[PDB]
Write a protein that binds this ligand. Structure first.
Ligand SMILES: Nc1ncnc2c1ncn2[C@@H]1O[C@H](COP(=O)(O)O)[C@@H](O)[C@H]1O
Ligand SMILES: Nc1ncnc2c1ncn2[C@@H]1O[C@H](COP(=O)(O)O)[C@@H](O)[C@H]1O
Ligand SMILES: [Ca+2]
Ligand SMILES: [Mn+2]
Ligand SMILES: [Mn+2]
Ligand SMILES: [Mn+2]
Ligand SMILES: [Mn+2]
Ligand SMILES: [Mn+2]
Ligand SMILES: [Mn+2]
Lengths: 321, 319
């Protein structure tokens, strides 16, 4: 239930599979690799897996190839990081009824689906929890491990810009940089790694932009054919919803993205007060008060936009009251 | 010359004018207001001034109205922050050699134009120097002052993305947030304040973009008439050169900007290794190894662009 019990369970087991969530982000990659590498330094037999393509922005990160898509492994323990429910880990959820499982996560809506669960939403990033676990295990950090652990703290705080960038976040980043974390390398690879094609794709996003409530709600969409027409992928749209929120006067931005055909992810970002986690949660997704998402499969975009935006607008009007 | 001597000079004077650089950035606003408010806590009478319009993105920051354009004041001491040469403070350079002056700056190209000069280019932001000065003066921070001092560290590091964001930068950021600096407020005011016209302007920047040296060099330009066509000013283009550097494979991005008519500001940003301060300095400007600029007036943009590109390509191939 707490960190101490997790540390004991990790110490008790040797053959460990560490799994992150599908559609992985920086915190998923950071948490998976930092924990995997920490456990390996203890002499454990460990593999790492995510049931999803690892985005190209991570390709130069040290040990990125340790994260597998199709591991061949007979683990004694499954460790699930940064994933709020079983569906979030893809095909590895079939191991949950077969292999003892640890959950380490910072989502308030975590269903506590492990045999042991350490869930604390006061952390901005699961990577902060892995940091503390590794230290409690006696893991010695080198600069590569510091860099990998810094990654998740940076990405989940929007590089120290989001409402979750509190004193403990800054303290953790300070400690990791002191230990050799390459903060410039992480920013360059995540933020300064844009294919030029992303600009034309985003212009198409701007052209489709709809505004509601005196400009406080902004939403747009990318259909799958538009991805292909622009030689782009959902890896190319990753920062777009944040760019929509950066428009003056916008309080909540919503981006609907169809990739691949028939799979529609909708990203929600809010600025000052509106809880998008409650909207996403009620729609079957989840996240955090200022950043949340839900994924639909087998539905048509003309049907997804009304359902999401109508529910969003309902809650948004209730919030203004 | 060092901080201790500067602190002693500041303590010896009770009527002080603090001045920042023209075309102010977050570090300028942060350093000017942080030092002004710190000195006021010692009971001194302090005015703050910049000979330029304060950008709209600062207008919700606490005490921003303390920065004046036309202060009426008879100071005993002039303190110039974050400014590498007299030209950089506009009309307040007329006070040099009339009011004893202190320079506090982090530019390697600083000409040492004060009576006392503490210049240390190892700092990512002048705001870090002001933070240390306020602590040495015995100032106690509240959350508004911490926010004001955090601002310059954040903007001069590109919100912790530039290569100057070292352990001391993160130590200072941590200590200021511990004292109540509102890191989220700062990021939203500076970065989430974009006019729609800003996106239309950037599209024409993209339409003019050129890549050189196999995609390692990116440059574009905005002429004055294009600002007017999109109902924009230099405030709207402020983050554009950073957006050009974020293109994959680009090592140096350069943006030529004519605003107002007949004034050309050339902005440079580099990623991994190219010393743009050398290029800008040799052209009459200055800055840092990864961020520098130069301003021309009375020159034609069609003659400025080829000459600057020519010099940049020469320096790029050297080292
Ligand atoms: N399909 C989903 N189910 C549950 N939570 C999600 C989902 N998609 C996104 N989230 C959460 O929302 C955050 C950001 O939203 P997004 O950018 O839309 O993925 C993530 O870091 C997750 O915590
Ligand atoms: N006219 C100028 N003279 C000297 N340095 C400049 C000038 N303009 C910009 N810089 C430097 O370039 C850096 C980036 O600002 P800019 O290139 O103006 O966006 C700043 O930190 C300044 O030190
Ligand atoms: Ca669900
Ligand atoms: Mn995640
Ligand atoms: Mn996370
Ligand atoms: Mn999350
Ligand atoms: Mn400055
Ligand atoms: Mn500065
Ligand atoms: Mn400067």
């Amino acid at each position: 239930s707490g960190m101490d019990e997790i540390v004991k369970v990790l110490s008790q087991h040797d053959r460990i599979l560490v799994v992150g969530h599908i559609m992985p982000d920086g915190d998923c990659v950071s948490s998976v690799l930092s924990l995997t590498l920490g456990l390996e330094k203890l002499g454990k037999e460990v593999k790492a897996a995510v049931d999803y393509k690892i985005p190209y922005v991570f390709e130069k990160f040290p040990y990125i190839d340790k994260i597998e898509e199709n591991p061949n492994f007979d683990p004694e323990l499954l460790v699930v990081v940064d994933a709020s429910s079983p569906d979030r880990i893809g095909k590895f959820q079939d191991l949950l009824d077969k292999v003892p499982s640890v959950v380490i996560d910072h989502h308030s809506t975590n269903t506590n689906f492990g045999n042991w669960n350490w869930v604390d939403p006061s952390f901005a990033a699961t990577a902060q929890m892995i940091f503390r676990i590794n230290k409690a295990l006696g893991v010695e950090y080198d600069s590569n491990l510091a860099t990998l652990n810094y990654l998740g703290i940076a990405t989940d705080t929007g590089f120290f810009r989001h409402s979750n960038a509190d004193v403990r976040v800054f303290e953790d980043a300070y400690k990791l940089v002191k230990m050799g974390a390459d903060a410039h390398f992480v920013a360059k690879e995540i933020l300064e790694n844009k294919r030029f094609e992303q600009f034309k794709l985003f212009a198409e996003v701007l052209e489709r932009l709809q505004l509601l409530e005196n400009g406080k709600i902004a939403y747009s969409y990318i259909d799958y054919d538009t991805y292909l027409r622009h030689n782009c992928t959902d890896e190319d749209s990753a920062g777009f919803v944040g760019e929509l929120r950066s428009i003056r006067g916008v309080e909540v931005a919503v981006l609907f993205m169809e990739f691949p055909r028939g799979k529609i992810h909708v990203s929600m970002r809010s600025k000052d007060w509106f809880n998008v986690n409650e909207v996403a949660f009620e729609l079957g997704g989840g996240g955090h008060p200022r950043a949340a998402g839900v994924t639909f499969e087998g539905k048509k975009i003309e049907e997804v936009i009304p359902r999401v935006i109508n529910h969003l607008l309902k809650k948004f009007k209730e919030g203004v009251e």
